[PDB]
Design brief:
Two copies of one chain form a homodimer.
Chain A: H1 2-13, H2 28-37, H3 48-67, H4 73-81, H5 87-96, H6 105-123, H7 125-145
Protein name (chain B): DRBM domain-containing protein
Chain lengths: 146, 142
């Protein structure tokens, strides 16, 4: 419970509004509590994992367009294609937010997809962008270094 | 007919409260004449291509929510390069035939990129939803 509350704080610490102020945690908090502590699926109808998977793809494209704008679209697409299943990004984010160290890839992916979907539904794509950008920009810069 | 006809057709899609056209109007005028060199750094085509993919996933989650994610992923995979969606939207906003067909997708991607930057993903969703939902219902029926 301390671990869960700390984990949820670590998630909110990454998410700010357009003026870099904390977001209103009111909507997201009970949704995160349900997916992190619930022994049953109570928010299946919300398709958070499905939306999260898609939102991460869109956020990566926005980060590439924003940070790597001097490059040909075909070159940004080449970079993005390495992350169509972004397990390397998710492993790096999981490490940073002290998610379980020895977590199976499919469960890691589903868990982070669900968190991203909740952040998207509550706060829009800037929350997803901010959630992934530090680790994603690190990986892309390594890709470009070869 | 005019650039203004295309602009009003685009804006009428993304209301029923009107949008503020201040920001989008000059951007749409540039790209609809083909003057895309001034907007190169904004990457509107790249962002638009990606925004269409995301908006389709949102429409599937919102309108086909009863279906297994597996079934939604199967449907979405058909639209990875959604040429039938681009053609149907082009027809609906009365875009004329370009000198080469590549300009249809480029024009619609740039429109979607501008709509996303000015109004966010809800504008992209509203811009594509009627044509996309029609195609997905054809897939679901056929």
């Amino acid at each position: 419970t301390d671990t869960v509350e700390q984990f949820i704080h670590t998630i909110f610490a990454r998410v700010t509004d357009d003026h870099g102020r904390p977001v209103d945690i009111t909507a997201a908090l009970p949704l995160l509590k349900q997916i992190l502590t619930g022994y049953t699926q109570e928010v299946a109808e919300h398709k958070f994992n499905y939306i999260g998977e898609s939102a991460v793809q869109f956020a990566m494209h926005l980060i590439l367009a924003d940070h790597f704008s001097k490059y040909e679209n075909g070159c940004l697409s080449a970079i993005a294609k390495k992350y169509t299943v972004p397990l390397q990004l998710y492993k790096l984010i999981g490490k940073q937010i002290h998610l379980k160290e020895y977590v199976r890839p499919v469960y890691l992916k589903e868990t982070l997809d669900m968190i991203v979907g909740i952040l998207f539904r509550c706060y829009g794509i800037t929350a997803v962008y901010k959630f992934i950008q530090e680790e994603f920009i690190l990986l892309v810069n390594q890709d470009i270094n070869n």
